[PDB]
Homo-oligomer: A and B are copies of this chain.
Amino acid sequence: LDHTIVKAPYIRLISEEVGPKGDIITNFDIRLIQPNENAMDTAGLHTIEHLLAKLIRQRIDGLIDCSPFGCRTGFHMIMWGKQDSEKIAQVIKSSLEEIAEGITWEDVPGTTIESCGNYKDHSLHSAKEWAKLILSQGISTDAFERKPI
């Protein structure tokens, strides 16, 4: 991927893989922030990871994992089956809208020393303001051209 030509926020299919018995696994680039222009702080990124794990699964089947990028500009989404980015775009948009306006502290799973490996590094405040910032730019179903929604 040439990171200098994409336009975030976008949803991008990274790859599809076929297992031996023929199951398909799709990998998605969920870019929340424009590469090299900004990066999410660890606390909000961490809280958004916990929330997205929950919210996505309420909205769609087949989620294997949703882990953040080391570069902190988004999330790697792994799913069973072919998926297509417009459905994924709507799942992410809807989830972000819930984080922006709906989630309270008690809806954030795993914020104790027993259930999380860095439980101090959380921030609902950061997650809500990031979600709002990301939503205000529109979620595009294409990475190279703006196609919001």
Contacts from A to B (Cβ < 8 Å): 1-4, 17, 19-25, 27, 31, 33, 35-39, 41-46, 48-50, 64-65, 67-74, 76, 78, 80-81, 105, 111, 113-126, 129-130, 133
Contact = CB atoms under 8 A, between A and B. Distances in A.
A49 B80 CA distance: 23
A50 B23 contact: no
B20 A81 contact: yes
How many copies of this chain? 4
Contacts of A129: 119-120
Given A113-B3, A123-B122, A38 B41 contact: no
A117 B73 contact: yes
Contacts of A78: 64-65, 78
Main secondary structure on A side of the interface with B: loop
Contacts of A46: 70-72
A21 B82 CA distance: 13
10 contacts: A19-B21, A19-B24, A20-B81, A43-B44, A46-B70, A46-B71, A64-B78, A67-B67, A67-B69, A67-B70
Given A65-B78, A68-B68, A117 B35 contact: yes
Contact of A69 (B21, B24, B117): B117
